Design a protein around this ligand. Structure first.
Ligand SMILES: [Zn+2]
Length: 257
């Protein structure tokens, strides 16, 4: 019964998920002056040309755009990563106001939203096995700021009315996630965790420096979603972000000078 309310929000999660107070929790604040350039990192390889989206689901905490992850069709490689990571889903975190919503922060700055493209390491066979490993997942995080619209987001925004409430899904084929990426792949990377329960410490985070712009109208549509199920009291799906956690014994590395 975790969520983002007063009585069940991030500050409560540790009671059911003690790993919430662990050594490599996410998100974190990215202190840009203390991140260090690492010349031995590579460029990221983001290979989404064969991506096969299937469905969009309101799971009660966010909406997930799900992919076919039964072959190496949309993969992330390179950067800090060893081996091949398959795209399974993406989702967002966002605020009630444009001044908050991101999970990671940059010099304490909060963005209006944050996109998470979730990938699992093929050496572990399935997502469920991958999340039990320290190098199981790679999550590409992309900040959203409010300004110009993102044309490649509009197909997502337009289906949201059909998945208003928890448990609703809709077919969502032929969506191209390349239309959600910024121009630059410059990034920061560090070892962390899922940002939702069970908070497993299985993620190599790759957070892009360049935000994407979305319009106020696009984010407004996110904010019409509901945390509740149909026929339950309406609670808008807003402020579905975990705040920054202690960095502890971690260094954030930069791919760029
Ligand atoms: Zn997320």
């Amino acid at each position: 019964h975790w969520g983002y309310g007063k009585h069940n929000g991030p500050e409560h999660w540790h009671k059911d998920f003690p790993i919430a107070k662990g050594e490599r929790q996410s998100p974190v604040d990215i202190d840009t002056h203390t991140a260090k350039y690492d010349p031995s990192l590579k460029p990221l390889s983001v290979s989404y040309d064969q991506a096969t989206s299937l469905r969009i689901l309101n799971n009660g905490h966010a909406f997930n755009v799900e992919f076919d992850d039964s072959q190496d069709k949309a993969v992330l490689k390179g950067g800090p990563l060893d081996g091949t990571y398959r795209l399974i889903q993406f989702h967002f975190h966002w605020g009630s106001l444009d001044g908050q919503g991101s999970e990671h922060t940059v010099d304490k700055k909060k963005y209006a939203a944050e996109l998470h493209l979730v990938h699992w390491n093929t050496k572990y066979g399935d997502f469920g096995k991958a999340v039990q490993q320290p190098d199981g997942l790679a999550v590409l995080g992309i900040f959203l700021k409010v300004g110009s619209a993102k044309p490649g987001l509009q197909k997502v925004v337009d289906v949201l009315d059909s998945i208003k409430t928890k448990g609703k899904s809709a077919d969502f084929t032929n969506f191209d996630p390349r239309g959600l990426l910024p121009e630059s792949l410059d990034y920061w990377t560090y070892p962390g965790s899922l940002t939702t329960p069970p908070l497993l410490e299985c993620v190599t985070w790759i957070v892009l420096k360049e935000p994407i712009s979305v319009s106020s109208e696009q984010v407004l549509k996110f904010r019409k979603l509901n945390f509740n199920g149909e026929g339950e009291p309406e609670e808008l799906m807003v402020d579905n972000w975990r705040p920054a956690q202690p960095l502890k014994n971690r260094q954030i590395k930069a791919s760029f000078k």
